[PDB]
């Protein structure tokens, strides 16, 4: 029907990519010691 006027855009700049990928790998270093027991 009508186009929705609530269309918003999402963005993730490079300095936030680096906090994301460093978050994931570090606690993957943490918890993977426990998953294999």
């Amino acid at each position: 029907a009508r186009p929705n006027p609530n269309k918003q855009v999402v963005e993730l700049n490079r300095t936030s990519l680096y906090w994301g990928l460093l978050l994931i790998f570090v606690l993957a270093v943490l918890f993977s010691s426990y998953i294999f027991n």
């Binding site: 994301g20 990928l21 294999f36």
Partner: peptide, 30 residues
Amino acid sequence: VNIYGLTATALFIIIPTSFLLILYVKTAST
């Protein structure tokens, strides 16, 4: 070895990795 050990890790790495890459690549193409 936990057989599901290395594949619960692998899905834990690759799926939020690929989540953040999609948001970044559409950002840097602006």
